[PDB]
Amino acid sequence: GTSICTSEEWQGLMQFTLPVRLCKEIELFHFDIGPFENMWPGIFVYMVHRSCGTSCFELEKLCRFIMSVKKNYRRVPYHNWKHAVTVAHCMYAILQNNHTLFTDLERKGLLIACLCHDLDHRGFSNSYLQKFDHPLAALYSTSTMEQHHFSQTVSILQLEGHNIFSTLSSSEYEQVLEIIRKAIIATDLALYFGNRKQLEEMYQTGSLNLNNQSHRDRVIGLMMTACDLCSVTKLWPVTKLTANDIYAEFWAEGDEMKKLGIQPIPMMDRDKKDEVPQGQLGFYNAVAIPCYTTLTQILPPTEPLLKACRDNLSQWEKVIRGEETATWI
Numbered sequence: 001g002t003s004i005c006t007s008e009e010w011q012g013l014m015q016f017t018l019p020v021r022l023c024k025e026i027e028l029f030h031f032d033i034g035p036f037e038n039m040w041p042g043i044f045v046y047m048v049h050r051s052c053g054t055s056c057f058e059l060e061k062l063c064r065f066i067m068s069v070k071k072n073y074r075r076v077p078y079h080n081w082k083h084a085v086t087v088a089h090c091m092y093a094i095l096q097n098n099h100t101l102f103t104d105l106e107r108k109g110l111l112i113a114c115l116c117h118d119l120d121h122r123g124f125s126n127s128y129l130q131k132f133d134h135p136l137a138a139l140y141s142t143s144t145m146e147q148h149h150f151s152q153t154v155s156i157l158q159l160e161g162h163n164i165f166s167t168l169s170s171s172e173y174e175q176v177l178e179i180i181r182k183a184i185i186a187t188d189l190a191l192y193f194g195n196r197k198q199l200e201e202m203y204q205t206g207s208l209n210l211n212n213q214s215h216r217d218r219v220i221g222l223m224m225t226a227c228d229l230c231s232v233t234k235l236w237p238v239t240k241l242t243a244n245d246i247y248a249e250f251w252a253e254g255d256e257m258k259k260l261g262i263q264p265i266p267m268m269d270r271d272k273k274d275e276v277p278q279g280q281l282g283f284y285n286a287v288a289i290p291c292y293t294t295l296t297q298i299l300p301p302t303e304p305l306l307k308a309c310r311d312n313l314s315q316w317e318k319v320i321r322g323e324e325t326a327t328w329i
């Protein structure tokens with residue numbers, strides 16, 4: 001099942017210090033971790049310490065956990081360690097801007113959930129696993145990969161010296177694993193459509209109440225979608241480069257489907273790259289823009305995410321009209 005970091009790996013992280021200039025930058029929604037790869041594990045420790053406090057976790061167990069999580073992301077084009085840290089940074093920015101809406105247990109649970117939410121992704125969609133009766137689809141009949149990512153998270157926590165949550169009360173341990181489970185399962189975009197619709201209704205009717213656990217769960221669910229999709233909230237060149245990686249995965253999957261006698265959906269067909277700009281327009285109109293619109297209504301300080309998403313939508317529209325300027329691969 002699960003891989004473990006080296007002694008040298010975690011002890012190195014324990015020693016890391018975040019360059020001073022980066023402290024100011026990491027607070028901003030639009031921050032791109034891309035140019036700082038050696039620092040990604042340290043960036044995560046920094047975020048946990050700012051959000052949750054330097055005493056939240058025993059530092060050794062936290063650095064062991066982080067480096068073993070990294071080792072259990074695969075070398076796939078998109079659903080990899082870079083994506084994990086990017087999603088956790090978006091969650092950090094949301095939490096910093098909305099800090100006292102969330103409990104200390106939720107903040108720690110959500111930062112961990114974001115880091116873990118795609119653990120052991122193989123570069124194949126739920127659609128593929130289920131079309132082709134992969135064993136995971138037999139074990140997990142809905143939200144197949146997401147149930148797997150949660151199981152991997154639990155596996156890593158159970159590794160010797162890796163349980164960062166062991167110091168919580170017996171009740172709080174149960175509560176945080178549930179926070180993490182619901183948060184990971186919520187990253188299944190199949191569930192997003194229903195969740196966003198429910199939230200929009202709750203908000204528009206004024207029945208939305210964050211003292212109501214089921215409402216809190218739904219808000220946290222939408223935060224998870226917003227963080228999972230946050231490549232669409234970066235500056236255009238970063239968004240575009242990330243889209244290249246997303247599609248590399250999709251096209252490798254479509255290649256597999258051709259061999260099994262199914263023509264893939266256009267989005268996963270490398271011979272249909274001309275349809276990508278309209279495909280992105282559809283995704284922004286149906287998924288991304290509604291998501292950030294609703295999130296901004298519920299959490300006003302998240303508005304820059306929506307502004308950036310709208311700017312990117314405008315850029316894809318420019319591509320469609322043939323107005324794009326030079327892009328670098």
Ligand SMILES: Nc1[nH]c(N)c2ccccc12
Binds near residue numbers: 229279280283
């Ligand atoms: N950016 C982007 N486009 C599509 N179609 C996506 C699907 C999942 C996650 C991000 C995506």
Ligand code: NI
Binds near residue numbers: 117118145187
């Ligand atoms: Ni996922």
Ligand code: NI
Binds near residue numbers: 118187228
């Ligand atoms: Ni993801």
